[PDB]
């Protein structure tokens, strides 16, 4: 029911994937480094309470009548619901507070990729908070109260709600399906694979940026799906796009979802074949994304897709080579990348006296 | 994760326990062929039987001819029914078509202008609606998406609204949920067990003057934006004064327990509960069944937040209209704005496997 907040690493990366997401990018409006550090400390105090299912500050009620309550109250009576709060720092943060020479080289700007149609207003950001929980109101409450605590020092640049599986009704070892109807997550780095996490996800001291040791790098892409076009494709076209069948999710020519793929049996521009580590010099990613459905656009089409999140030890050797290799992906006909951001996710909060960003700000 | 029975004298999704998630879609009709529209209603009813039982529509999501699109888009495969209910309604504009003019119920009244309205016409109205409620958002989206696909060329989605969490209750024996202002919302509603009150206030009766509507209800939908910046800087006393209940327990002012009966004379004259209470409106009583929403940011550095208000009633003229008229002096008006609106006639239930949505009208 709760996930420990403290550790060598931030929670919400290798910890079990929760049913819901509220992801928010913030822009910083203060130039005062001391005021920003103060905020990080207050945010960390609030996060400790939130992830344990307690209200922030003095609480949501019972205080002075003439004062606004410290907590806005909409999570009263709810459980912690495995809430994790994961903070990250965008490249643009390092132009402030004299941090320019502390930007990690692994926090690389992404190139323009073919077919990008990025909405500037739903891209970038000085920092992010990823709120994952099994109850979406727990996640929203966390973001709403962090933004309220930060008011005057940060503003919300963009936000995205997402959903995965509903654990109360769906088994844990069942692979969830994305909104194209295919199982999504079969060949991924699991949180149990400590060695693969050290190799592919966690920043190491020898990587060149000491304050990031134990952190990770996050790529976020809001990927719209062209639902109505996809739904008019034949079953064979859909399966040819991925290289797996739709019902079982087995690789072509195999029987079971978890059978290892035979890449030469897939079409040359099939998604799995292009994204597989063997096709990318061994590049391997921790995918931790969520489906979204925001409504319908002005043409009646479903505004839906995948809020893709990938964690890696170095953006240059993780997301960039794989996404570059998708230049000819058969899936490109049915998707469009419309938002993007990258973040350096710092190491964990070690104990009750530590605070978000302490290794960077000291 | 269980199924809610689809057949009955009334449609499910009204008196039914309120499910965690909402996907509401309003459709406009694009065909002038009454026969083709009746055929759609029958095909939609057949799909709804499958969907509410947790089965795929038509011949299924895979295993068909490779060269044909699958009958079901597949993203709900392996999921439980999740208490999915599908509730159809007919908007007043529908009755300008198919020779239905003289069948428009008088109880399906157009709403007057209310002070403070700022209604977006694009996200208002609609020839018909489908309310999809379920505990699993993927199940709800799947249902809307597949109904829309089946209806291609005969209906188009006009607007849609997702609700990430309920703000209503038809089960007073379960915990009352909170809206994004942090107050319990749903304490004094109509419970699904209160058969006499549902007959008096919710279900249309033959004697009311429209026989085809016997057993149905009337639905008002209002999209309400919340000014959370303004609210969140108000004092606790101000917030509690606005409603007439305390924030922590949700008891009427002066009393100890949520479900103690309000003593209205102890509330401020402009308190929401005092103004909305049946005793202040000649006995007018509503079944409220709304959900919270957030659609990103407002572009001004803040989270967007609202309440998608849904009310069912026996006659719009004796339910929503008098109550909302009495809210002209509501203290809550300082913190909300109605920005979308629609009314629908919700026909009687689908009696058995031979029946179909709208059969008593057509
Ligand atoms: C809407 C967009 C996308 C959809 C629907 C999608 C869907 C899928 C599916 C169905 C699979 C096979 C099952 C699995 O192993 O998870 C898969 C695998 C994979 N995808 Fe995607 N994907 C999308 C975007 C991306 C992007 C943007 C990247 C990276 C830049 C990516 C990288 C991968 C990787 C690495 C695998 C595993 C390949 C393997 O090792 O077998 N995907 N994806
Ligand atoms: C964002 C908008 C609104 C919010 C935050 C809100 C909030 C509340 C709250 C906190 C209660 C007290 C607990 C309860 O009995 O449910 C309440 C009661 C009630 N509300 Fe609202 N409400 C809103 C809009 C409306 C509207 C538009 C109507 C009808 C036109 C309405 C009608 C009622 C009724 C009939 C009651 C029960 C009064 C009683 O019999 O005691 N509300 N509302």
Author numbering:
A (entry chain B): 56 to 417
B (entry chain A): 55 to 416
What does the paper say about this structure?
The SFX structure was determined to a resolution of 1.88 Å from a total of 72 615 indexed and merged diffraction patterns [Fig. 2(a), Table S1]. The distal heme coordination site is occupied by a well defined, full occupancy water molecule (W1), bound to the Fe at a distance of 2.40 Å. A linear fit to the data yields an intercept (i.e. extrapolated to zero dose) of 2.37 Å, which is very close to the value in the SFX structure (2.40 Å) at comparable resolution and within the experimental error for this bond length in the room-temperature structures.
Herein, we have chosen to use an extracellular dye-type heme peroxidase found in Streptomyces lividans and referred to as DtpAa. The overall structure reveals a ferredoxin-like fold typical of dye decolourizing peroxidases with two DtpAa monomers in the crystallographic asymmetric unit.
